[PDB]
Amino acid sequence: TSCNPSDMSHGYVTVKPRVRLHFVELGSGPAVCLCHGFPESWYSWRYQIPALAQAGYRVLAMDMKGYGESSAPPEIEEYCMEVLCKEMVTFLDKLGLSQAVFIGHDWGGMLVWYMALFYPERVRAVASLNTPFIPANPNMSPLESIKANPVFDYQLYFQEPGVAEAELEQNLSRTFKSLFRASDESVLSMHKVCEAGGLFVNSPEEPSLSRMVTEEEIQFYVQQFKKSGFRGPLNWYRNMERNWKWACKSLGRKILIPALMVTAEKDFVLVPQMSQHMEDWIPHLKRGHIEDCGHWTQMDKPTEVNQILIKWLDSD
Amino acid sequence: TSCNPSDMSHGYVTVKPRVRLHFVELGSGPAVCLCHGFPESWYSWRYQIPALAQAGYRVLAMDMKGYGESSAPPEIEEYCMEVLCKEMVTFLDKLGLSQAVFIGHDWGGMLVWYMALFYPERVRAVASLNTPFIPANPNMSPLESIKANPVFDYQLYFQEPGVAEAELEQNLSRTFKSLFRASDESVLSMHKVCEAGGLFVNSPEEPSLSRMVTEEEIQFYVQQFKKSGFRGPLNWYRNMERNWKWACKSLGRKILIPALMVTAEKDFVLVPQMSQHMEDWIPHLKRGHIEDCGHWTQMDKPTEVNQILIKWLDSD
């Protein structure tokens, strides 16, 4: 049970002159806002949208800024957490929603944590898939926290505007088939991306279709990314200094709203152990864990994702 | 408080391959679907949208089929009540709404009574402004009812395709300034429209702005009706026999859901006494009545409309 795009309600909200945000909407009850990661789409929530609606929730599945039918301004600073969060609050204002539950994955995970810290009054409850909440280290540069973790090398590859874009936009069909794979089907090492050409140099030219996706599902993502490309999406990675600067102003404060951290056993970039000290900042934090599950959590173990989210939603 | 269109959430639902219904959405809580009349817009609910939203309701204010950003197919049969009603059901299905409160005015009022009649399981409660529910008379065509009451003479003028269009479309600013007036500011001859040749042909060339509206608000309607003209809206009147035959299939069943009839003292076409026997067919009918109020109820007496609807909503 997934979604057909033309059978959904499509919403559009202008949060500022140059910027409209597009979303899909299904169900009635408390408002649940779903925020995808990189490089995805509202469509990445196709298994959760109908399930949460049927569980008695009003689901808003976003195209995040830079993606799909949402605006994709070229300026890098338009995608820093501060600016993205304010727009999400403007979004709630224009829909007349005093609060929403926020659920995010990957970069969307990151964003909802930030909403929880800087806009707790507008966030009823907060849930993240894969993305942990790591307090800002005011002494360690952000750039530094990477050259200290080997699997984050691709993030440096993403910094130079035009470089990752041109490789990722080269064959869009190849890009998504290469990325959207189970952990055991993976054909990418995140180790040595900068020195050894790009992200796909040593991976196949005509990669096979993963067990998780159909050819029709891949083509939806292709069509979405034809309209703005990867620049906007990648600009999410190009604000680490600003995001760190901004995060440090919150250094003392605590998330007191209900919170859920869901970890994927086989996400080799957003590892479960990265989240291990989160109760030290959120004592009441609930958890879920999903075995045999990679980075693309919603796609990989949709049934477990739905069970975990619904159980948490119905209780806190 | 009114509305500024670019400050609103805009939603779009495809109900049939080439039919797309546009709506504005504001607020959280039980779903309230507002259906305007002829020749209006979602915008006609500008005073109710924020009031109802602030009172704890999720307001969906529609552009009805043929209007604004909704599809306006040219075929007459597309605007018979049976088809419009089924499309509103499909609208709820794609939004994932099991029920909604339907509130309509004028033609939208007629649509909501039929929603209540034929789809009571999808209608939480029903309210109508001005438009009464009169059960079909199986021994009297709709042409014979219009002859008896000569205040519906304009409806005959509306039947021949192209004729009423040419006059209403000639000068849009004039059309809306002449129509949107308080009862005491009326310049319209409703009695002899076919004899005169035109609806406005005896009224001013450069009419004044009614105390009810600003020039800005009139210009909003002008921009809207440039998109599709009057053929779609006027097609609402061109299905009397189709509507009659369909309403006869209800076989004198009753409306058992909570219902509200709001009458307007000075509407000289949808007269208050036209509603007088409705409690026979509608056991649980509550009533409101607005004094000094003409046909354009929502603009004329927004504060009184709001208090009546909000009180009824909170109790029923």
Residue numbers in the entry:
A (entry chain A), B (entry chain B): 230 to 545
Q: Any passages from the paper?
A:
First, we solved the structure of apo hsEH CTD by X-ray crystallography, and our results were found to be in excellent agreement with previously deposited structures of the full-length enzyme, with an RMSD of 0.257 Å on all CTD heavy atoms. The apoprotein crystallised in space group I2, with two hsEH CTD molecules in the asymmetric unit forming a homodimer. Superposition of the apo and holo crystal structures gave an RMSD on all heavy atoms of 0.198 Å, indicating a high similarity of the two structures. Minor changes were observed in two regions proximal to the F267 Pocket.
